[PDB]
Enzyme design. Sequence first.
Site, PDB file in Angstrom:
ATOM      1  CG  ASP A  70      -2.175   0.776   1.125  1.00 14.94           C
ATOM      2  OD1 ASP A  70      -2.104   2.020   0.962  1.00 14.94           O
ATOM      3  OD2 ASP A  70      -3.263   0.178   1.244  1.00 14.94           O
ATOM      4  CG  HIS A 101      -4.824   4.670   0.986  1.00 10.74           C
ATOM      5  ND1 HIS A 101      -4.569   3.315   0.874  1.00 10.74           N
ATOM      6  CD2 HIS A 101      -6.035   4.869   0.414  1.00 10.74           C
ATOM      7  CE1 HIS A 101      -5.577   2.729   0.250  1.00 10.74           C
ATOM      8  NE2 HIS A 101      -6.483   3.657  -0.035  1.00 10.74           N
ATOM      9  CB  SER A 312      -7.323  -0.084  -1.452  1.00 12.54           C
ATOM     10  OG  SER A 312      -7.700   1.168  -0.926  1.00 12.54           O
TER      11      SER A 312
END
Length: 383
Positions: A70, A101, A312
């Site tokens: 990620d 994120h 995601s």
Amino acid sequence: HIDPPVIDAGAVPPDETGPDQPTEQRKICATPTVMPNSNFADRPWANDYLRIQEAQKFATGAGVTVAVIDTGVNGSPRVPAEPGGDFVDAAGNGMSDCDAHGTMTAAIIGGRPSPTDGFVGMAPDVRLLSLRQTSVAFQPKGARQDPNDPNTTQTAGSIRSLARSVVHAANLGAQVINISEAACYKVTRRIDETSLGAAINYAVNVKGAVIVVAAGNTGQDCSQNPPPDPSVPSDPRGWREVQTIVSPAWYDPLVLTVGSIGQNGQPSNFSMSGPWVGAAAPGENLTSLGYDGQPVNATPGEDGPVPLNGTSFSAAYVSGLAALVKQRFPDLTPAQIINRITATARHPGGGVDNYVGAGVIDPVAALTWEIPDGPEKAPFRVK
């Protein structure tokens, strides 16, 4: 027109960290935030929808290691990630999140509980490894590199670095690998991604890792795929209609590709459809943990805070579930674990479609239903 990918099993990339080419930071680091009048004492809607607390009676992910590929994570007591390497900054180790994120992805997977709020990840006892593989905050120092060669695009570079990061995560002993990246490109601008297919085959079939990947979000290069043509029963998933390849999403069924649904259970309008989508999970208006391991439910935007959305995050819920399944059925292969998950997924009408695949996951059912073990390995095309 597009056909399913063929894997060159001998093309496994070397297990090296670092960016596809030298990079530098161009953006100031982002920081997650909190919507006005948020009450974090209540369960996030995704925890209620997925019955996470009921699922946790049966497993917690103890003994399982999840790699989060990620944007990196800023670790905390409640998101105790460990360095898995950096594939964006040559100087990094994966323990720095400049995008606001990766940290929230990791918290959704294995974020620990607190007496002061209702947030908990799906599998709060897993070991978490952070591999930073993308970032909007970094750019290559050198310029392109022949602007008509599709293998010199940034999309192509990210594909090549993703490949090494999958090899790396598997060699570090990840049993579940969550991939947030969804590289999109056109049929006519085909990228050589043999290194990626080879990496995935290696991680899954040689090292026994479950790989869960984002279906992708619509945006710049990811334009929505049209639905299958129902008048062509020989192409029920509509490969022939595909306009946008999404990778590694399209390595289904070696990987489990996860689309998003909203708070009312509807398939999300930003979720990339394709003949390769296998399941779905909550991906809108989410709550997670921030850089201090405290609850967050927004990132700043131009005209205010913006809710946590994205496939995601949907994939993260499914990676969490795979960790739960892995703990509870430790002898199952990756294909067999994925089979428990897809066999208990559901949506109105049923069957498999290009939006939610087998349907929205059902953690309690994945953990408790009598489901015959599937074949040990998934079939695939090889050269």
